[PDB]
Design a protein around this ligand. Structure first.
Ligand SMILES: NCc1ccc(C(F)(F)F)cc1
Ligand SMILES: NCc1ccc(C(F)(F)F)cc1
Length: 330
């Protein structure tokens, strides 16, 4: 079987992407943030503290005839940005773009951090990293992808994120009309539970390509591109007036500047991020200082190929017994 669903940016800056997901019987449709950097499927629900819900669509397990409470199970997650949520666990039927999994663990939020409350457009997360990172206790639960794997035509999913535009998540098949050229595959390490891979280098604008190994994770759940301080310094040095701002928390640049492109290596192939993708707009309304889409990973501890990088490519998440990542231009 296969599934295919349209994913849509939540605002004019592509801060995140939401994808409709059908949960329960009869279907309750929630718009979830597909996150290859985490492994929990959790949703705003009728159990969420009422003051922490502000416009989100909630899952109501009592109205689903297929929902079953998972006795004694709880969950608690903290994300790298300081966000967190926690609650109890149901199992229920979950469908993505026609692809149905029965008995999927649906984690019901009882408490969420303020960053989720203030994001009215995101009803939850759908984790797509490896199941070893799932936070359900005492019995760890499998991701949607892991549960669907056996029934998929091919054990893959693909991410085709749009620049200021809708895109597609496909499960079980590779749409050969969605990219140009060939797909270049590269090795994945699962030792930390992430889709972790090694980029072969980078170039700034039309500059010389620098061969250098950059270990990082492919994370649809993170907005920006987080790279080592040396790389990020070389990029912003080519932008007149750009500087690292402690009060803002990263590199900013005069909004009148034109940004150079950024190239990253995948084996012998090259993925080019257009400079316009790196502009995240004024730091505050009316400001002439703009926030950069490439930032240092030094404070984070890991390099992150977030949406800024992934939306420049067609990305194959190959969940075969030896997993690989595929990148193609589009
Ligand atoms: N998108 C989920 C996520 C959040 C944080 C991290 C970090 F910062 F720990 F690497 C990775 C993945
Ligand atoms: N990386 C996972 C993640 C995704 C979205 C959010 C936000 F923005 F909704 F709070 C936080 C963390």
């Amino acid at each position: 079987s296969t599934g295919s669903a349209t994913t849509t940016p939540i605002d004019s800056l592509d801060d995140a992407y939401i994808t409709p997901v059908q949960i329960g019987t009869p279907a309750q449709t929630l718009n979830l943030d597909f996150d290859t950097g985490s492994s929990d499927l959790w949703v705003f629900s009728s159990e969420t503290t009422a003051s922490e819900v502000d416009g989100q669509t909630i899952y109501t397990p009592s109205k689903s005839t297929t929902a079953k409470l998972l006795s004694g199970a709880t969950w608690s997650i903290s994300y790298g940005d300081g966000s967190s949520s926690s609650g109890d666990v149901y199992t229920d039927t979950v469908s993505v773009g026609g692809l149905t999994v029965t008995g999927q663990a649906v984690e019901s939020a009882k408490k969420v951090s303020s960053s989720f409350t203030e994001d009215s457009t995101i009803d939850g997360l759908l984790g797509l990293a490896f199941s070893t990172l799932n936070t359900v206790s005492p019995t760890q639960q499998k991701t949607f992808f892991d549960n669907a794997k056996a029934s998929l035509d091919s054990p893959v999913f693909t991410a085709d994120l749009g620049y200021h535009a809708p895109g597609t998540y496909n499960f079980g098949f590779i749409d050969t009309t969605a990219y140009t050229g060939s797909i270049t595959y590269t090795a994945v390490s699962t030792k930390q539970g992430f889709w972790e891979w090694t980029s072969t280098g980078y170039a700034v604008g039309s500059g010389t390509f620098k061969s250098t190994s950059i270990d990082g994770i492919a994370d649809t759940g993170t907005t920006l591109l987080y790279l080592p301080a040396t790389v990020v310094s070389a990029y912003w040095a080519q932008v007149s007036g750009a500087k690292s701002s402690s009060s803002v928390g990263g590199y900013v640049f005069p909004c009148s500047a034109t940004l150079p492109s950024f190239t990253f290596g995948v084996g012998s192939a090259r993925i080019v991020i257009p400079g316009d993708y790196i502009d995240f707009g004024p730091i505050s309304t009316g400001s002439s200082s703009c926030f950069g889409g490439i930032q240092s990973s030094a404070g984070i501890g890991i390099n992150i190929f977030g949406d800024v990088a992934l939306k420049a490519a067609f990305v194959v998440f190959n969940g075969a017994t030896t997993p690989t990542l595929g990148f193609a231009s589009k």
